[PDB]
């Protein structure tokens, strides 16, 4: 008995086709994903194979103007139009609270929504009763398949589920729901969930009776072959786990942003044992046409969003240079503008202790994803800005020893010239690099804006002194190779969403004109 599992995860509100870098679509022929194209590929597989399930493993909520304006009404409408068979709750499904999960998603979705490890209590227990499920018995042809869902234990930190939900251990909560399906004479069982690849592997290993694991949260690309785009696989598709009972359990994920359709074909025997499994995420590129009905519907919802996305937030009278040839090689005015925004946002005074808690800002050149042109009568829109910052990182507050920041600035240029993203733009820092020195020894001047002073002025960094810095969450977690930051910092406090910070700054200043002014120099 043969099943075809189609799966998406972490689509993150990418309802329209994107660029290859999952931002806004400029050249039609180089564009990818979107529900209209996903509909085309799904219809075609459903016309070719008898036993097809379309599963989502959470994080449909949050990512574009779509989610901000329609608040998950768009998720219900366009997942309903695609006849998804089941969805597991992600952490971002709680971003507008359990209230904002119920009101559009759980009430308008025609498909089952699953989490075996989220328990409801208080007056929410009656209000949410039956709207999400521990497990689902799905008829597929003349057989049944059980689904059990699971959601990251960490959702109560990562999002806003409130006090009336309990996120219990996935393994402990999953096992009794799998046992229940076995007592209902269900011999084929899929764990569909949103805790990441490391947890997906442990579920496959430890939960007796799970045949297959379909996953999200870690944006993990698994591919068997020469990769068709820029995503480097963490391993082969599917990833086989030997369970403690000696079973081979396929584990799958499909990256993020609706760029790939996961595709897994399983042969089961009569008793529900997995005999064989093969597949590969399908790259959804311009060689699959957008379905014309879904596209016309997308266009309909688009009309009310065009107001919102071409909303003037402020004016620039300069070219905002966030091009990679500038921001990965030298000081760029886009970098200066984002760091000046970051410092403007984090304003706390104390009379005899400091002018500001924070004077200092770093940002990896790689994070800045677009320029903005000033010729559109100087207008900066949300869309324009979305293109610079497509990915909803937060700007966080860290404490670092001088020596740690010295090491970060060494890493910034350790392989200078090769268009890598680790090259730092700055505020409240003057740095000089000598590129003719050996890597680890190219920082010849590092001056920082004091805080323990009434008049802000520049002093040479001290190795044994502690500084407060605003930097992207990405750098805080050691992205682009900044392990010295992740491993050596002393405090981390999580801040506001990148685009929100840059947006309020532009709207408060009304007219910006950031210059390149010598924060970064070369001998």
């Amino acid at each position, epitope marked *: 008995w043969e099943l075809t599992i189609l799966h998406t995860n972490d689509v993150h509100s990418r309802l329209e086709q994107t660029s290859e870098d999952s931002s806004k679509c400029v050249n039609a022929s180089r564009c990818m994903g979107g529900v209209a194209r996903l509909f085309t590929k799904v219809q075609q597989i459903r016309r070719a194979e008898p036993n097809v399930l379309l599963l989502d493993a959470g994080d449909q909520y949050q990512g574009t103007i779509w989610f901000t304006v329609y608040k998950g009404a768009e998720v219900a409408h366009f997942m309903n139009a695609l006849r998804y068979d089941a969805m597991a709750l992600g952490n971002h499904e709680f971003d507008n609270g359990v209230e904002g999960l119920i009101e559009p998603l759980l009430k308008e979705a025609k498909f089952p929504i699953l989490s075996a490890n989220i328990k409801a209590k208080g007056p929410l227990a009656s209000q949410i009763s039956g709207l999400y499920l521990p497990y689902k018995v799905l008829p597929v042809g003349d057989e049944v398949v059980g689904i059990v869902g699971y959601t990251s234990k960490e959702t109560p930190f990562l999002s806003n589920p409130g006090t009336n939900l*309990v996120f*219990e251990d996935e393994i402990t909560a999953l096992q009794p729901e799998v046992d229940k399906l076995k007592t209902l004479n269900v011999n084929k069982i899929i764990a569909l969930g949103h805790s990441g690849f490391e947890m997906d592997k442990l579920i496959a290993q430890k939960v007796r009776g799970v045949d297959v694991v379909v996953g999200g949260h870690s944006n993990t690309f698994l591919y068997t072959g020469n990769p068709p785009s820029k995503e480097v696989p963490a391993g082969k598709y599917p990833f086989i786990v030997t369970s403690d009972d000696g079973r081979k359990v396929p584990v799958v994920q499909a990256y993020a942003f609706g760029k790939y359709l996961g595709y897994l074909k399983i042969e089961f025997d009569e008793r529900g044992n997995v005999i064989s499994s093969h597949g590969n995420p399908i790259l959804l590129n311009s060689s699959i046409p957008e379905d014309p009905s879904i596209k016309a519907d997308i266009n309909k919802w688009r009309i009310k969003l065009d107001n919102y996305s071409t909303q003037e937030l402020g004016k620039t009278i300069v070219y905002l240079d966030g091009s990679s040839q500038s921001c990965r090689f030298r000081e760029c005015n886009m970098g200066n503008l984002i760091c000046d925004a970051m410092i403007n946002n984090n304003l706390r005074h104390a009379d005899e202790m400091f002018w500001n808690h924070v004077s200092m800002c770093i940002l990896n050149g790689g994070g800045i994803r677009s320029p903005i042109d000033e010729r559109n009568n100087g207008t900066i829109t949300w869309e324009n800005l979305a293109a610079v910052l497509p990915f909803g990182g937060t700007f966080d507050l860290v404490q670092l020893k001088g020596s740690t920041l010295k090491k970060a600035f060494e890493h910034s240029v350790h392989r200078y010239g090769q268009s890598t993203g680790e090259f730092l733009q700055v505020g409240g820092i003057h740095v000089v690099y000598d590129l003719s020195r050996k890597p680890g020894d190219r920082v010849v001047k590092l001056d920082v804006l004091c805080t323990k002073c009434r008049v802000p002025s520049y002093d040479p960094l001290k190795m044994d002194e502690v500084y407060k810095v605003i930097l992207p969450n990405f750098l805080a977690n050691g992205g682009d190779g900044f392990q010295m930051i992740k491993d050596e910092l002393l405090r981390h406090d999580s801040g506001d969403q990148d685009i929100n910070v840059v947006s309020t700054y532009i709207s408060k200043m009304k007219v910006i004109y950031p210059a390149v002014e010598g924060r970064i120099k070369f001998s």
Partner: antibody
Amino acid sequence: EQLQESGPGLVKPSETLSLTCTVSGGSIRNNYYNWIRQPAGKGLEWIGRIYISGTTNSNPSLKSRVTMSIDTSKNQFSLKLSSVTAADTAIYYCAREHYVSGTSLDNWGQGTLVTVSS
Amino acid sequence: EIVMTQSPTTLSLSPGERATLSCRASQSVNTNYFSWYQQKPGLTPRLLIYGTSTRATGIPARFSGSGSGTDFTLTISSLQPEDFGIYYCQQDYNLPYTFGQGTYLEIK
């Protein structure tokens, strides 16, 4: 309806800490049970929660140092805090959610003052 | 974590006047998860308001809880001597739970 915390008033730097909140009004219901602390003079700081079933979340500021426990045949909930420091001297409160809303902190204990010093 | 900036730090008004305390959250808080505490420097803090707006048992009608999104307000309309001490706003929408710096209210 009342919550008293058991656990001593004196701690060494680099050392343990057993605090045991006892409910005896009625019993541990289907609710989150909290620990909070306050540095003397300054403001309130949330430590962690535990549901009946044993599930626990704690403050990421303290994350590595907190363990918590619950027992319904006993009828209370414990706290443990590893590796203590000057900035940890503070009054330690147990508390539970308002039983209509399943929100807020309603029926607090007396508290216990703890001190780090040798 | 959601930062709770209460203002002012210290009010001094006369009995019979109106104390309007203001709490500003760095992120939007669903009104089901916003609450107000009274504390007398020393002893157990007592719940005033849960939801943004609901009085707890034993709390008089003087106390009007208000607000939504980012901006929450605690109005006390006719102040009396025993209304001395510290007042904290609280959110349990996101972990950690977080309390404000506190607002210090002396009767003139």
